[PDB]
Design a protein around this nucleic acid. Structure first.
Lengths: 293, 290
DNA sequence: CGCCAGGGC
DNA sequence: GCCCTGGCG
């Protein structure tokens, strides 16, 4: 009933009532039929896939968040307080009595939305690479924690970063793009792709990132609308082509017995992470099977 | 009516109803009585000053924010929609009818608080240096934009980065500390101070910052409470002593013809910016007459 | 353009 | 430990 206890309640209810960002992305991926599309589809249509995935995730989330918000706000309506108030004075009281509650709820909502938007964007990209058939290790499933996807895998990367691809994602950049050169420079990363839906980043940012060997990747629509001229801004289609070309380099490479068991271990860990997601397990198990192929 | 007409209203109403972060910090600086403290107070007790400033700025805003929201929400109340509704039913209606309007207002508020919190933290630090009598340029009153304070000034820094100090500030770090090595490395900065009140940053972060020549500075309270043994964490007290030592090297310097002209121009800009603030203006006038 | 009185995941 | 369905200053 206090602003404090209401936070704990919002917390408890959120966790109960919302599936994980990745579970939502996976649900949506299968619902939109992407789980039956061949790898060429993802290779050829990554920008449209991303936007459709984004659109549907939000379409499903937003009526649900609205009702969760309405419901939260209802664990604090006080029928006994508001006995003989007029409807106007009733609403008046509400806007006066529970400012920290209302605000804390909306605060918890935005903080969830921010965390989830990033996590779902990463998950969307992750499934994109999987759908494309491209060997990746997912950061949060197995190099700074800022990298989301390591192609073909951390084991191979750790051995030698040649012919690899590292992809990070930020739905919008603000000044937070500055984090990426920091991480690139901290670990000696050769280059990083920085996937974004941001329509507003500047040329000065692009050039600083360029100097730091961070490549911005966005949708064709965003690129053609806002960065048409600009060969420093890539599309997801460019990226996916690059990833596809580099993945042919990992195709029938023979690992030493030692690296092979490390790759297996890494894949096994990720299958574990993605235990409840047949499409992803299947994706990893093909990679596992590829080592004995 | 529409959120697009209510968010345009939220912004109109905020601009109209709240004084700027600096002005709040300045009001607070002077209310606490800091405009009467000698330079040695600021030099010797920077953490006490910062803590007390942060304490009170919040108090002289927290109640106020609370009421601003209430006023804003009263513009959603539709007398004709709700007349003859049960009061409880009018509340259910309200919590079902405008919860975007309600989110949009609390979102705008937190976005205000975050922005104001950093800008007030910078302002608190800037008046700490002014209070201490230390020559600084205030980056946003005329080196990355991330740097708030350049001691003794950007003209001299540009002449030679030796004997200078750059201070940046983040109320909390999260992963955003990563911006600072980026900025240090991008411009060849020797070292930067990162002022923070964050009590939760890890050893890894401290070590990464350290390698990057970013010096983390926090209150003596936070240091002794969270980082007591770690000598890579400085206190504002350590920082102020360092700023003080460097400032001497500048006060019996003699500039050439051309540099003094850039400097007074730099100051000129900052007297213009803080025109409406006597204590700060006083600060720059003395600087200008040398 | 930077801030993050910043909780969620 | 990173996210920023992120507007404000």
């Amino acid at each position: 009933l206090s602003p404090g206890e209401f936070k704990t309640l919002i917390s408890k209810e959120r966790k109960s009532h919302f599936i994980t960002p990745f579970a939502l992305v996976y649900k949506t991926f299968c619902d939109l039929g992407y789980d039956q599309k061949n790898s060429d589809y993802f290779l050829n249509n990554p920008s449209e896939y991303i936007i459709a995935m984004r659109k549907n995730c939000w379409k499903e989330f937003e009526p649900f968040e609205k009702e969760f918000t309405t419901r939260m706000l209802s664990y604090l309506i006080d029928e006994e307080r508001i006995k003989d108030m007029s409807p106007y004075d009733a609403i008046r009281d509400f806007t006066m009595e529970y400012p920290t509650h209302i605000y804390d709820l909306a605060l918890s909502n935005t903080q969830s939305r921010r965390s989830r938007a990033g996590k779902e964007f990463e998950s969307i990209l992750e499934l994109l690479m999987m759908g494309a058939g491209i060997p990746v290790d997912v950061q949060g499933a197995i190099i700074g924690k800022l990298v989301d996807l390591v192609m073909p895998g951390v084991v191979q990367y750790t051995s030698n970063k040649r012919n690899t691809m590292l992809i990070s994602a930020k739905t919008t950049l603000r000044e937070r793009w500055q984090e990426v050169p920091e991480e690139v420079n901290r670990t000696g990363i050769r280059e990083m792709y920085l996937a974004t839906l941001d329509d507003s980043f500047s040329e000065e940012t692009i050039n600083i990132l360029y100097e730091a060997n961070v490549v911005v990747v966005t949708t064709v629509e965003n690129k053609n609308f806002k960065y048409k001229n600009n060969n420093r801004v890539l599309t997801f289609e460019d990226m996916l082509q690059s990833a596809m070309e580099l993945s042919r380099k990992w195709n029938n490479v023979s690992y030493t017995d030692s690296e092979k068991e490390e790759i297996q271990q890494s894949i096994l860990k990720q299958i574990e992470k993605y235990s409840d997601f047949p499409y992803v397990v299947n994706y990893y198990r093909n990679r596992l099977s590829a080592l004995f192929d």
